[PDB]
Amino acid sequence: MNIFEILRIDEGLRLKIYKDTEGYYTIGIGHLLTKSPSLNAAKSELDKAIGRNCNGVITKDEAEKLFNQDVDAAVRGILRNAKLKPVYDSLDAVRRCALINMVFQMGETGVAGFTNSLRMLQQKRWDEAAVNLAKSRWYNQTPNRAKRVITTFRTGTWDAYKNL
């Protein structure tokens, strides 16, 4: 299990501009193009991202390049973040991927605000962690994704993504 497999599971893969759950134009694997109700802005945002004139259409390759930039930004996000760093730095490789998955979805700052949760993760208190993560909005909103992630931390395995 690698990050690419997880996120495509979590985020999906779309080769043409599309509106997500929140009504936002996206492309690829969770790449947010714009929040404006405007295909033009979206298409120009896509163009600036890729570097070619794609006319709202990309290939698997480009979807992959983007994704790669996306996860690096996530990872660079955690490393620059004072609250996240210590957490990230102490978890194992499986558990760290789960951390990276939350940052990817909700950004460096949204995760950073899960103060207690993050604390318990530090204190190797998985079930304590599990329960707090759950009491969130995030969980209410994308329960199936949340639960996958939450089970990664709790169990320390890829159990939640192997059989779907």
UniProtKB/Swiss-Prot annotation:
Outcome after substituting N132 to M/F: 2-fold decrease in enzymatic activity
InterPro entries hit by this protein: Endolysin_T4_type, Glyco_hydro_24, Lysozyme-like_dom_sf, Lysozyme_dom_sf, Phage_lysozyme-like, T4-type_lysozyme
Effect listed in the UniProt record for changing E11 to A/F/H/M/N: Complete loss of enzymatic activity
Chief place where the protein resides: host cell
Residues binding substrate: L32, F104, S117, N132
Gene behind the chain: E
Reaction catalysed by this enzyme: Hydrolysis of (1->4)-beta-linkages between N-acetylmuramic acid and N-acetyl-D-glucosamine residues in a peptidoglycan and between N-acetyl-D-glucosamine residues in chitodextrins
HAMAP family: ENDOLYSIN_T4
Record's note on what induces expression: Expressed late in the viral replication.
Organism: Enterobacteria phage T4
E.C. code: 3.2.1.17
Active site: E11, D20
Protein name from the UniProt record: Endolysin
Pfam families: Phage_lysozyme
Any one annotated GO CC term: host cell cytoplasm
Resulting phenotype, T26H: Facilitates transglycosylation more effectively than hydrolysis; covalently bound substrate
Family recorded in the similarity comment: Belongs to the glycosyl hydrolase 24 family.
Record function comment: Endolysin with lysozyme activity that degrades host peptidoglycans and participates with the holin and spanin proteins in the sequential events which lead to the programmed host cell lysis releasing the mature viral particles. Once the holin has permeabilized the host cell membrane, the endolysin can reach the periplasm and break down the peptidoglycan layer.
A biological process term (GO) from this entry: peptidoglycan catabolic process
